[PDB]
Amino acid sequence: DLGKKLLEAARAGQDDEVRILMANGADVNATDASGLTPLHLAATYGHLEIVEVLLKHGADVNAIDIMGSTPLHLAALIGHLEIVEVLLKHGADVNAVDTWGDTPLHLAAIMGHLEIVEVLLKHGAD
Amino acid sequence: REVISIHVGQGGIQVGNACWELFCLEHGIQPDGQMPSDAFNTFFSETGAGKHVPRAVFLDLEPTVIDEVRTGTYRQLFHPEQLISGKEDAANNFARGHYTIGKEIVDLCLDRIRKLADNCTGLQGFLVFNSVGGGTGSGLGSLLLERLSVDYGKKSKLGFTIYPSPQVSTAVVEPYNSILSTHSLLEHTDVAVMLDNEAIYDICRRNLDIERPTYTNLNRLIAQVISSLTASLRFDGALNVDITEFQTNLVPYPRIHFMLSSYAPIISAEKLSVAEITNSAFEPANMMAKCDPRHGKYMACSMMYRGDVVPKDVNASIATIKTKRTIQFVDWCPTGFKVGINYQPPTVVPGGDLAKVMRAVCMISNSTAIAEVFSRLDHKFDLMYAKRAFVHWYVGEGMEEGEFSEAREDLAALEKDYEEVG
Amino acid sequence: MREIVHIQGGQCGNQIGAKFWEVISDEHGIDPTGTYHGDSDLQLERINVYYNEATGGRYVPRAILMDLEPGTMDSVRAGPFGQLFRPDNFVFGQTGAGNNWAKGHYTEGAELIDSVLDVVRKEAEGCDCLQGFQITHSLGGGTGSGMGTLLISKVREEYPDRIMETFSVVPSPKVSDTVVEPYNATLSVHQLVENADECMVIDNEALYDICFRTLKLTTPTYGDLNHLVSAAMSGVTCCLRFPGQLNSDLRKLAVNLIPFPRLHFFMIGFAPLTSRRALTVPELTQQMFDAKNMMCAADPRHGRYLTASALFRGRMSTKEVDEQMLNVQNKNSSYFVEWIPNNIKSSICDIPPKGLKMAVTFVGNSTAIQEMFKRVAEQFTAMFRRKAFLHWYTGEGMDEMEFTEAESNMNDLVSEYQQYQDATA
Ligand SMILES: Nc1nc2c(ncn2[C@@H]2O[C@H](COP(=O)(O)OP(=O)(O)OP(=O)(O)O)[C@@H](O)[C@H]2O)c(=O)[nH]1
Ligand SMILES: Nc1nc2c(ncn2[C@@H]2O[C@H](COP(=O)(O)OP(=O)(O)OP(=O)(O)O)[C@@H](O)[C@H]2O)c(=O)[nH]1
Ligand SMILES: [Mg+2]
Numbered sequence: 001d002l003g004k005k006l007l008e009a010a011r012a013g014q015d016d017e018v019r020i021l022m023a024n025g026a027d028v029n030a031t032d033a034s035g036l037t038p039l040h041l042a043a044t045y046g047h048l049e050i051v052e053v054l055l056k057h058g059a060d061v062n063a064i065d066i067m068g069s070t071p072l073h074l075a076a077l078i079g080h081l082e083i084v085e086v087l088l089k090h091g092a093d094v095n096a097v098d099t100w101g102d103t104p105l106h107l108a109a110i111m112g113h114l115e116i117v118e119v120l121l122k123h124g125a126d
Numbered sequence: 127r128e129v130i131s132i133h134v135g136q137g138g139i140q141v142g143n144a145c146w147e148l149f150c151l152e153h154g155i156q157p158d159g160q161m162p163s164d165a166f167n168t169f170f171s172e173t174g175a176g177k178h179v180p181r182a183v184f185l186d187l188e189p190t191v192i193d194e195v196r197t198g199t200y201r202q203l204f205h206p207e208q209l210i211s212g213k214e215d216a217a218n219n220f221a222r223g224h225y226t227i228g229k230e231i232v233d234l235c236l237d238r239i240r241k242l243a244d245n246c247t248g249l250q251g252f253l254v255f256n257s258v259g260g261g262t263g264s265g266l267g268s269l270l271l272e273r274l275s276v277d278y279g280k281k282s283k284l285g286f287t288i289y290p291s292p293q294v295s296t297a298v299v300e301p302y303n304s305i306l307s308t309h310s311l312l313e314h315t316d317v318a319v320m321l322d323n324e325a326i327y328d329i330c331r332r333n334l335d336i337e338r339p340t341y342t343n344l345n346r347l348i349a350q351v352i353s354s355l356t357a358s359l360r361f362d363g364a365l366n367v368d369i370t371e372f373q374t375n376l377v378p379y380p381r382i383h384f385m386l387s388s389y390a391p392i393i394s395a396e397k398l399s400v401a402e403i404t405n406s407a408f409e410p411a412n413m414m415a416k417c418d419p420r421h422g423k424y425m426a427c428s429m430m431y432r433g434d435v436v437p438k439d440v441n442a443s444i445a446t447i448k449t450k451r452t453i454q455f456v457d458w459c460p461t462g463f464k465v466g467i468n469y470q471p472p473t474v475v476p477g478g479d480l481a482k483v484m485r486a487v488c489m490i491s492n493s494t495a496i497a498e499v500f501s502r503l504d505h506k507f508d509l510m511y512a513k514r515a516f517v518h519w520y521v522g523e524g525m526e527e528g529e530f531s532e533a534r535e536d537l538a539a540l541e542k543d544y545e546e547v548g
Numbered sequence: 549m550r551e552i553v554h555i556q557g558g559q560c561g562n563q564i565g566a567k568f569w570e571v572i573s574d575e576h577g578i579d580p581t582g583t584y585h586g587d588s589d590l591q592l593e594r595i596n597v598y599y600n601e602a603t604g605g606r607y608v609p610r611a612i613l614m615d616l617e618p619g620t621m622d623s624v625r626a627g628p629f630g631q632l633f634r635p636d637n638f639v640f641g642q643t644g645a646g647n648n649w650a651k652g653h654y655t656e657g658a659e660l661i662d663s664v665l666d667v668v669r670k671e672a673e674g675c676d677c678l679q680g681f682q683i684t685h686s687l688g689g690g691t692g693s694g695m696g697t698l699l700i701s702k703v704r705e706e707y708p709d710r711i712m713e714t715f716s717v718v719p720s721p722k723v724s725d726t727v728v729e730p731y732n733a734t735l736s737v738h739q740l741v742e743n744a745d746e747c748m749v750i751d752n753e754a755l756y757d758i759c760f761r762t763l764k765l766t767t768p769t770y771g772d773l774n775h776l777v778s779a780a781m782s783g784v785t786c787c788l789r790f791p792g793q794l795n796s797d798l799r800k801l802a803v804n805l806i807p808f809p810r811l812h813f814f815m816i817g818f819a820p821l822t823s824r825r826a827l828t829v830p831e832l833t834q835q836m837f838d839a840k841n842m843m844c845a846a847d848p849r850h851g852r853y854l855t856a857s858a859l860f861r862g863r864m865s866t867k868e869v870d871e872q873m874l875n876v877q878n879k880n881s882s883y884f885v886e887w888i889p890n891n892i893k894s895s896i897c898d899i900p901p902k903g904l905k906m907a908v909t910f911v912g913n914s915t916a917i918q919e920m921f922k923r924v925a926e927q928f929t930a931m932f933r934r935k936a937f938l939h940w941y942t943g944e945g946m947d948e949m950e951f952t953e954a955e956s957n958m959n960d961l962v963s964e965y966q967q968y969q970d971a972t973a
């Protein structure tokens with residue numbers, strides 16, 4: 001199943017495997033059992049180039065998993081600055097709230113990612 | 127009629143260091159055991175080579191304090207078999223001294239005590255020196271009391287027992303050890319003399335004008351009291367001549383046997399009459415336990431004078447004190463007031479703090495006022511025990527938690543006992 | 549009670565450990581060849597507590613050096629006193645643990661633990677009377693954290709009657725922005741609650757704040773942080789290393805500080821704080837209590853002390869210490885529980901630390917430390933709810949339920965601090 005192979009290559013940072021799967025018809029917006037997408041997984045594990053290629057090919061920047069987590073939540077939690085900015089550039093919802101009541105700003109603050117906090121605030125985080 | 131002294135833990139050993147220093151000076155014994163120039167044989171054996179040896183053991187669960195004896199001024203005075211030390215101490219934990227650590231050395235302690243008793247024509251009893259606030263004197267001391275009650279069933283035991291003060295305290299659990307010890311002393315001593323560090327420290331600070339006193343300062347004062355109280359054991363006298371007479375003269379009810387003592391005059395070596403020192407002996411400022419004996423009643427009082435003291439002058443001072451009526455005895459009590467005079471004045475210790483005096487008095491009494499000392503420690507105990515603070519340290523070293531409430535209840539009963547007598 | 553066996557594990561463990569040995573060897577007059585030079589006989593009276601005596605008359609740290617990576621120990625070997633450590637007490641792998649508490653506790657660390665235990669046993673069995681063990685490590689990495697707690701568990705089993713003490717470095721994003729560190733530290737705190745008697749907390753959040761705000765260092769290097777750590781460690785251990793009576797060994801220290809066995813994490817304050825005129829006694833007593841002087845990023849005025857000890861060092865008056873200790877207890881009466889009588893005690897050690905004539909170390913058991921555990925717990929919970937990097941741990945064979953068990957044990961610790969904080973007499 002190409003969707004699940006794409007999920008796993010996005011999670012693992014296998015750039016060439018992503019490009020090959022996408023070129024053979026892989027579903028850019030495939031979901032795993034909890035609703036995580038390839039963009040969610042690359043944002044979490046820090047793979048900037050895969051994040052950008054997915055966004056250039058129809059990835060939903062504001063997809064939520066079953067817990068309401070957006071890719072921007074995960075990038076701000078883990079501390080990937082350049083990914084936070086790319087997601088914002090492509091219309092990520094800066095004030096998305098997950099099922100725990102957290103925003104990306106709250107997660108970045110908790111984890112002490114101060115530059116990300118400042119970027120989120122400049123983009124209107126509440 | 128020999129008497130064997132048992133010194134347990136730091137406080138007991140260092141008070142013993144001061145007592146034996148004074149005993150040697152009073153009997154003219156040098157640290158060598160030699161005597162250039164019977165009664166003093168109650169406290170010393172004698173060897174074929176003319177050595178006079180204390181009838182004593184020093185017992186500790188760590189070697190630091192014992193090593194200082196083994197290597198100090200009196201290294202020649204004791205046989206090495208008399209000086210027993212463990213490797214790791216009780217860590218201020220009654221349970222460690224009584225159970226897990228003390229159990230490994232008590233037989234060795236009882237064998238050395240048995241060697242002393244085997245050299246006694248007619249052993250009459252034991253003096254047991256310890257503090258209650260630590261773990262070794264309290265816990266191993268109480269365990270030794272239990273075993274001595276079984277092995278020497280017919281022999282009297284008199285405690286010289288150090289109670290704690292915030293001013294010279296290194297352990298928050300002191301009230302626990304104090305109550306557990308006092309429960310042991312209630313059952314396994316016939317008499318116990320309360321050496322309350324709170325009062326003794328204050329006497330050194332005030333009467334002796336020592337700004338922050340050392341244990342040596344406190345201990346040299348204690349030794350003068352203990353020497354006065356044991357004067358009739360070691361010399362010819364007529365009041366408290368054997369250990370058993372302490373109980374008969376001072377204890378009307380078996381478990382009410384904790385004694386308040388005093389000394390007069392307590393004056394520094396920088397720069398009084400029979401009547402004056404007799405008044406001073408009834409003053410809080412001269413009491414070795416922190417209480418007001420004017421607020422209580424006396425079951426018993428023994429006054430032991432030393433030195434240039436005429437019997438008629440004692441009788442006159444006591445007559446006057448009786449009329450003043452502040453000092454009250456329990457009506458119809460089967461014990462009461464007794465007086466004794468030894469005509470030798472107290473001995474001066476080189477480098478001591480106490481001024482040379484031609485007469486002195488030491489009182490030992492059974493007063494209800496002593497309940498104040500127990501009441502303060504019981505209250506501290508109660509605050510901590512209500513949260514079971516620190517209790518796990520004792521339960522983990524072989525004590526059942528039930529022994530806490532058993533001891534506390536014993537102390538509650540003793541407090542009610544004093545209240546009813548009042 | 550005499551000898552202590554020291555083990556330093558991982559990068560943090562070995563760096564703060566090396567500084568400890570430098571600082572106390574100077575205090576004791578020991579040079580890098582192990583030869584004593586000094587005046588006071590107080591320096592050698594309890595030298596056996598941390599040092600073995602060799603044939604040569606030289607003194608050798610009773611120290612084991614452990615890591616899954618050879619790097620930091622190689623630089624320890626090259627450091628000032630590196631040639632004084634027993635060469636056969638270096639136990640190192642080649643792999644590393646990759647900041648993964650599982651690699652340290654269950655896989656790479658598990659493959660090396662027998663070689664560590666071999667050396668530890670050899671030192672322990674050679675002691676006249678062993679007091680216990682001292683472990684220096686970070687809780688946020690993989691080796692010091694995961695393999696350190698494995699070692700604590702194994703030694704606890706073989707030596708259940710001896711005292712287990714740690715100097716544990718708590719992580720902070722201010723110092724290392726590495727997001728699995730809350731996992732590693734929560735897993736370790738779980739271990740520490742069950743298997744250690746005494747934990748001397750060293751909070752990188754607090755060290756960072758001290759270096760930034762009070763010492764005005766804009767970007768604090770590990771050297772800057774460790775300058776504070778070594779000052780605290782010398783001051784905390786002074787009572788074990790020099791003649792005295794208060795807290796004079798690990799077991800007596802424990803009996804004074806720990807009313808409830810799980811609550812064995814201590815807040816340490818010290819004064820003066822220094823970078824790499826003497827203070828008066830009123831200044832020492834005020835500063836030692838101040839949030840700005842604590843090694844734990846918890847505000848002592850947000851909780852109550854169960855117990856505490858103030859260990860003064862230098863030529864100062866007993867009278868004046870008594871006077872000021874009465875003053876600070878009166879002024880801070882709201883921050884001590886009322887149901888433990890005389891729960892604050894003090895002592896004076898005549899030997900001051902290097903470059904100072906007056907100093908103090910305040911060691912306390914305060915319910916305020918719950919603030920530090922709550923900080924780590926919030927980060928743990930943020931990561932764990934999104935299951936970020938969890939496969940790194942279950943991939944080494946660890947069960948996810950261990951995450952929930954540790955999280956719950958540390959949450960119960962916080963609950964218990966709050967119970968005694970609100971208790972009344
Ligand atoms: N009066 C007097 N009290 C002492 C002396 N030494 C210790 N104490 C008191 O004894 C209590 C402390 O117990 P220690 O006797 O030192 O303890 P220990 O029996 O050696 O038991 P561990 O050390 O816990 O094994 C406190 O109340 C001290 O003030 C002393 O020389 N004279
Ligand atoms: N105060 C202080 N913290 C340190 C030091 N070195 C590392 N740390 C902190 O310790 C944590 C990382 O743990 P390390 O000691 O480096 O890791 P390790 O134990 O060597 O484990 P692995 O490298 O994963 O095998 C982070 O929180 C760092 O900030 C140090 O010298 N001083
Ligand atoms: Mg002792």
Ligand SMILES: [Mg+2]
Nearest residue numbers: 558559617691
């Ligand atoms: Mg490392």
